[PDB]
Amino acid sequence: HMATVQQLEGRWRLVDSKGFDEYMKELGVGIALRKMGAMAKPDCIITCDGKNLTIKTESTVKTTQFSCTLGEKFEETTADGRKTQTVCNFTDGALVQHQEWDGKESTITRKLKDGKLVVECVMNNVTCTRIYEKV
Amino acid sequence: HMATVQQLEGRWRLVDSKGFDEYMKELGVGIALRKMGAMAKPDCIITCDGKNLTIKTESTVKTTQFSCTLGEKFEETTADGRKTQTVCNFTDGALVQHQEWDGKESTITRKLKDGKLVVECVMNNVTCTRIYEKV
Ligand SMILES: CCCCCCCCCCCCCCCCCCCC(=O)NCCO
Numbered sequence: 001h002m003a004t005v006q007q008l009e010g011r012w013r014l015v016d017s018k019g020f021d022e023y024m025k026e027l028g029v030g031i032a033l034r035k036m037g038a039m040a041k042p043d044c045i046i047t048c049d050g051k052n053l054t055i056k057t058e059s060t061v062k063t064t065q066f067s068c069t070l071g072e073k074f075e076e077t078t079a080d081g082r083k084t085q086t087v088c089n090f091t092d093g094a095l096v097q098h099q100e101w102d103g104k105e106s107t108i109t110r111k112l113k114d115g116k117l118v119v120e121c122v123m124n125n126v127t128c129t130r131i132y133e134k135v
Numbered sequence: 136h137m138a139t140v141q142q143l144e145g146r147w148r149l150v151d152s153k154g155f156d157e158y159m160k161e162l163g164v165g166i167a168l169r170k171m172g173a174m175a176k177p178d179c180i181i182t183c184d185g186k187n188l189t190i191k192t193e194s195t196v197k198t199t200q201f202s203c204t205l206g207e208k209f210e211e212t213t214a215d216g217r218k219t220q221t222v223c224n225f226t227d228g229a230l231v232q233h234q235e236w237d238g239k240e241s242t243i244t245r246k247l248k249d250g251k252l253v254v255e256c257v258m259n260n261v262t263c264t265r266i267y268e269k270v
Pocket residue numbers: 024029033036037040042044055057059213214215243245254256265
């Protein structure tokens with residue numbers, strides 16, 4: 001020191017955190033988003049062009065949704081933070097996943113349609129389709 | 136020959152989506168975490184040892200936290216959903232970021248210690264420290 005601002009530029013990778021959960025709580029961050037925040041190894045990117053300063057974050061969130069035996073009911077912990085009663089079946093060429101929690105209910109279907117992974121979700125009256133391509 | 140489960144095995148990467156925001160909404164997902172759910176482009180990883188099925192997820196989220204000139208107030212949109220009045224000063228070798236919203240405030244000070252980046256976040260009485268290494 002004294003450090004210039006050019007000394008802070010580049011990519012920085014998280015290696016230690018303390019009290020972050022508490023910090024998010026004091027901002028008013030909800031539990032689900034909080035757990036997401038703490039499971040992410042964010043990269044911080046800083047650049048400074050004279051007085052002009054930019055800060056970017058880049059976090060990958062590698063996560064196991066669930067492991068299960070087909071046909072065996074289990075307790076799922078979801079990304080949004082529900083504790084559901086889930087059973088998966090491979091039925092008629094499709095991978096069905098049925099979620100029960102709080103008396104509510106959702107089904108998620110996964111089929112192969114023209115080499116693409118068509119994913120279909122259903123709750124009450126609300127549906128949703130996602131297409132994936134193989135890597 | 137209709138689909139096998141082993142036909143669904145591998146890395147699948149999102150390319151299209153209808154109604155996913157509404158779906159998250161019906162499940163009870165909060166506004167802030169919805170926004171992220173739509174901003175992410177997950178990879179879906181599916182493995183199936185006969186009857187043992189695991190679905191993994193993996194999504195990278197690049198987001199420019201903010202962009203400013205030092206000493207000069209701007210409106211910041213934070214990851215957890217706040218809109219803050221923010222200013223960033225570089226003072227005595229340290230990057231200081233100060234946030235004001237709803238008569239509340241927070242300071243995020245960015246320092247260099249032993250080549251490492253040491254980021255302290257403070258709201259009222261709550262202190263969070265995160266360390267980073269250069270890549
Ligand atoms: C790297 C922290 C961002 C967290 C990664 C994504 C988290 C998803 C939701 C997070 C909700 C909490 C938002 C409060 C912002 C905290 C940024 C200060 C810590 C930091 O190292 N900020 C980077 C500046 O050096």
